[PDB]
Design a binder for this molecule. Structure first.
Ligand SMILES: OC[C@H]1O[C@H](OCC[C@H]2CO2)[C@H](O)[C@@H](O)[C@@H]1O
Ligand SMILES: [Ca+2]
Length: 516
């Protein structure tokens, strides 16, 4: 893996449950049989959406966690673990949504103004989830729902491996910038969602707070606004994405726009930790969506990411670190294209986030964007997950592998692996001052024969006078590897004469010793 290290020793695989309730797509007895089968194929836990529209449907504080408890019982029965998703977003309307579960309708009656929902540049109204701007409503409702959920799941703390929060649309921390209704679906540029009167007032007050008065605002922006009511969001999104974003106004608006998401992260994170920490003591995470289209467009740079609220990823990840939330990213299965008309750079994005996350010491997890029906895609996920230090990978979705032993088998082989610590030893390596030794092998875990950025470095044992390293390998998998010397200048000097193998890698720690 990058920086000469191996796969993450804490790696685990998870499986996404159906979008609809179990008894609607199968039955409990069979669900349990499926879970034992999934477990058999390397899956550690099942992630499941617990819809807000289901849990607090009829009215404020009129909870119904019965389904969630019943689900948890079958998980305990099947001898598995779960990762619930407190889905404070609507099911239905997103790519691949076979369901229809809106958030509670009484919630909208809580406000007189338009603070709760979103409105695009063209006036399209979105109500899939609550507008992060309405922090007061969010603090009350989420605080209440998280606390109530914790109490109801307390009896099953033993089968809960982690908890995911919903930061917005489709359970991801973003703005609903890409929707068919708004004419902003893939691969089109996105639209800014700050056009409610509430959003306008907030930006305006945020600006005047930063500068004090309009006279200072104009000085900073080099503008000539006559009144304060002239402080508004981008009148032309495309034009803003073309050049507006470069001005002081542009820099400021984008700061506020993304900032709303950073604050939201800090808020739901504090509510979640207060609610779940003492009773469960498990990791809490949130997701960032993979908006890969319009990434390398020359005219509108990142024309899909910006409207979604992703302007500065590094600053955005700092918010997760502060909120003490683990982060999940998508699109691990795809590769870069970066060509007209889409300008899709999936693989580059992932690598960027992964770098930042690992730099910041943030636990990283990944998921696939679309249903995988080919092992070639599994191989792509493998390269990313085992080289970019992902702590876990979640497969979307249940029915894909559950009713196809072929995919299920390829998944077990490639991604449903168990990391084990093993000692690699190489004897009599002709090293000179400046020579560093590495190993590379056939599997994604060993860098897939790459010697440039994925090899695993070995270290010299002064006492044993040889080169060795504690490498994390996939337990019970056949591997082929070879050690090589890399010179001071960074180029391969020579290779180990004979190709080594471990068929298979032991389930218990030990060592593999070979000579140059
Ligand atoms: O089942 C998990 C999630 O799966 C989908 O998201 C697409 C994949 C990413 C954007 O989680 C659904 O649209 C979400 O509502 C759901 O929370
Ligand atoms: Ca409530």
């Amino acid at each position: 893996a990058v920086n000469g290290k191996g796969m993450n020793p804490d790696y685990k695989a998870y499986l996404m449950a159906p979008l609809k309730k179990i008894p609607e797509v199968t039955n409990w007895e069979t669900f349990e049989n499926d879970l034992r089968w999934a477990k058999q194929n390397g899956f550690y836990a099942i992630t499941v959406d617990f819809w807000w529209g289901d849990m607090e449907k009829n009215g404020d504080q009129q909870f119904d966690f019965s389904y969630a408890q019943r689900f948890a019982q079958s998980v305990k029965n099947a001898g598995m673990k779960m990762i619930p998703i407190i889905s404070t977003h609507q099911c239905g309307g997103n790519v691949g949504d076979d369901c229809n579960v809106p958030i509670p309708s009484w919630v909208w009656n809580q406000k007189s103004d338009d603070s709760l929902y979103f409105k695009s540049e063209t006036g399209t109204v979105n109500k899939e989830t609550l507008n992060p701007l309405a922090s007061d409503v969010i603090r009350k409702e989420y605080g209440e729902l998280y606390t109530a959920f914790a109490a109801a799941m307390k009896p099953y703390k033993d089968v809960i491996a982690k908890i995911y929060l919903s930061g917005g649309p489709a359970g991801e921390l973003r703005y609903p910038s890409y929707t068919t209704s708004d004419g902003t679906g893939y691969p089109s540029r996105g639209k800014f969602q700050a056009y409610t009167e509430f959003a306008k007032s907030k930006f305006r007050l945020w600006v005047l707070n930063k500068y004090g008065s309009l006279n200072e605002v104009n000085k900073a922006w080099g503008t000539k606004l006559i009144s304060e009511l002239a402080i508004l969001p981008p009148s032309d999104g495309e034009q803003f994405l073309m050049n507006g974003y470069l001005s002081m106004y542009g820099k400021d608006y984008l700061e506020w726009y993304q900032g709303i998401l950073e604050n939201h992260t800090k808020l739901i994170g504090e509510l979640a930790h207060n609610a779940f920490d003492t009773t469960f003591q498990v990791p809490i995470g949130a997701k960032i969506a993979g908006v890969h289209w319009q990434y390398n467009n020359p005219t509108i740079p990142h024309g899909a990411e910006k409207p979604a609220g992703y302007n500065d990823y590094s600053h955005l990840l700092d918010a997760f670190k502060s909120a003490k939330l683990d982060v999940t990213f998508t699109c691990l299965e795809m590769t870069d294209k970066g060509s007209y008309p889409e300008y899709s750079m999936p693989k580059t994005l992932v690598q960027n986030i992964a770098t930042l996350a690992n730099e910041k010491g943030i636990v990283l997890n990944g998921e696939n964007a679309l249903s995988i029906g080919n092992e070639e895609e599994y191989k792509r996920v493998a390269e990313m997950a085992f080289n970019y230090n992902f702590a876990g990978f979640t497969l979307l979705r249940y029915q894909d592998v559950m009713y196809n032993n072929s995919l299920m088998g390829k998944f077990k082989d490639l991604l449903g692996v168990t990391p084990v610590m093993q000692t690699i030893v190489v004897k009599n390596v002709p090293t000179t001052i400046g020579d560093t030794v590495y190993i590379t092998g056939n599997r994604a875990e060993l860098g897939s024969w790459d010697t440039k950025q994925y090899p695993i470095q070995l270290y010299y044992d002064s006492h044993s006078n040889d080169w060795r390293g504690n490498v994390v390998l996939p337990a019970e998998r056949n591997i082929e590897f070879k050690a090589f010397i890399k010179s001071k200048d960074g180029t391969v000097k020579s290779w180990q004469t004979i190709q080594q193998s471990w068929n298979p890698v032991p389930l218990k720690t030990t060592s593999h010793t070979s000579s140059w």
